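Weekly modeling sync, notes
Attendees: AB, CL, MP (scribe)

Item 1: holo prediction request
CL wants a bound-state model with chloride ion before deciding which constructs to order. AB pointed out that an apo prediction alone won't tell us much about the pocket. Agreed to run with the ligand included and paste results into these notes for async review.

Input as submitted:
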Amino acid sequence: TTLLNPYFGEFGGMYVPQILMPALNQLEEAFVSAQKDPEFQAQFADLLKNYAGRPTALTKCQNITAGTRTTLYLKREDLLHGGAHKTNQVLGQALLAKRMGKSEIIAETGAGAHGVASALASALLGLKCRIYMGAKDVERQSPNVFRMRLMGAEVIPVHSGSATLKDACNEALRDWSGSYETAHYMLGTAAGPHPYPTIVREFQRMIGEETKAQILDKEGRLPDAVIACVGGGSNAIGMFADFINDTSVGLIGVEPGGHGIETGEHGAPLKHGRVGIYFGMKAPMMQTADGQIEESYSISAGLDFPSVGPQHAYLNSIGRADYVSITDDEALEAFKTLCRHEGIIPALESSHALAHALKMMREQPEKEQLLVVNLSGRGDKDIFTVHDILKARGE
Amino acid sequence: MERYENLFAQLNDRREGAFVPFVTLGDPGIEQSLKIIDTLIDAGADALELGVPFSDPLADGPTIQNANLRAFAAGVTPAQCFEMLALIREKHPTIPIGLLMYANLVFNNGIDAFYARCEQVGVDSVLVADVPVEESAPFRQAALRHNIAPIFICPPNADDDLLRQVASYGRGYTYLLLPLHHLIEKLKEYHAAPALQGFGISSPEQVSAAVRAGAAGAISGSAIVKIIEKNLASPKQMLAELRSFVSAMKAASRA
Ligand SMILES: Cc1ncc(COP(=O)(O)O)c(/C=N/[C@@H](CO)C(=O)O)c1O
Ligand SMILES: [Cl-]
Ligand SMILES: [Cl-]
Ligand SMILES: [Cl-]
Ligand SMILES: [Cl-]
Ligand SMILES: [Cs+]
Ligand SMILES: [Cs+]
């Protein structure tokens, strides 16, 4: 029994061991209560404004579209405190944890942005934070691990399975089952068991609400399309939510194509996987023929996840949103182009969204189109990675 | 078939608790796993609970995580597991065989087809670790259509509505993960499948304790796998230790 619908059509649900169901039910109730509570909303608004820096800019990118009939705006989540959109919903979830009387936080991270966001929020709001991270991730994300530790977080390497984000995901659920009376699990994307896909959307929806206000002010209309990268689904659903009922507005999600879809080395389960049940949800998965969960791949660590949130699978199925893929090389070009022509260093995750908008423009340069790309994060974290590639190419 | 119903009837006649060990199929290899399983039975296991190696076992602690790795290191697949199950049943006609599964391996090739294959090879029950009663309808339905008992966990944090649901939905046995008396009595009140205590059973005294509390027996969820882990280098000692352990645990159930 739940207060809200756990499904988006066939996708979603609560596929957890029985022991975890009270934890999910408690969280749902607290969320529903919080949503009707002006005092909660005011606290959340205060942190978003005065701590994180909202509203974020909407930047018109003139150089990159010169000589075409594309007008391109970037929603500047790269300017939020922490350097990515992840901060929005961690602040909301940390307040929910406090509302429920919890004193501890568990979080998973792959790339490290959500873990840093969880550690910063924990430091601010007086929660004791532990971060599970695949041992492979820990090894290759020394900078993010150090920030978490500076900010007072315990960082726990996970050696189980492939020692990566999924296993990190598992260990977090493993922990919470035992600890939920005292600890809140701060899931970092719009995926996992209900109520997380719904909570994460509602605590990211100011992205799209601001974008709409900003585009009406600047252009006097709605965008023709809004475009966002899809790792698990949070930044994209945050951009899409307020436009879902505006039927004229295209909703485009970009999955990582890795070395190419045909190589099988990618992270595009929504369009190239198969529905399965894992991480608490029924959703498109990359999986072997016999149902083992496959390892994804992307140049971008933040997109390297073999599943996707259920609301995206639903919006795809009914034709409301369209999903595409962008390869490592396309994303790298978009990265370089934005740096050189607009003076903004984008996260490699966000660079996938930008790359698809550039393709929309370049393929049809006399098509009139007003596009918004969600620039989910800044790419300071990526400069070493990009350096090593350009060098190995000899550029 | 009626393998659980027949076991409990025979056990009730003998004023006896059930002892049920868990092992991972194919740990540490197919040949040794088949021999391990034959040793549990010979030593006095009343039933078996058998895991299928899965890439992401989010309900398992490290003992069983490590069993899965060992099995995968040996190349073990769900298909090979079903081959093993057929062989085990062909050798042992009456012992109840339950699988502990993850949802994706059941859903993978279609839920109905999974339970049909369980029936073909002579499995008696399936516990799907990450399917709560709330999500269980297609699993329970397919199980019962194919003469398979759907097993549910009754957790420590169970409330009354849960007790009624588990009572109504489960068959074969109830997996026991409110005072311990309260749960057992209510489950009987609601005509639930006989309860097996599964919570940290690693000693003979725990087996006798479970039976005294009014449970029908006990499941050793990881103690057997620890014995495997410890004796990897000595196949011979492994079997010896397995025998000794299962003998002790079983003896504790008679008295
Ligand atoms: C700047 C940025 N853009 C997009 C994404 C992609 O994540 P969604 O699809 O928006 O949820 C990420 C992800 N990173 C995670 C992996 O969960 C992490 O930090 O651990 C990111 O850091
Ligand atoms: Cl449009
Ligand atoms: Cl369309
Ligand atoms: Cl037999
Ligand atoms: Cl279990
Ligand atoms: Cs232009
Ligand atoms: Cs993905």
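Recorded for review: Chain B has one domain: 2-255.
Action items: CL to compare against the apo run; MP to circulate these notes.
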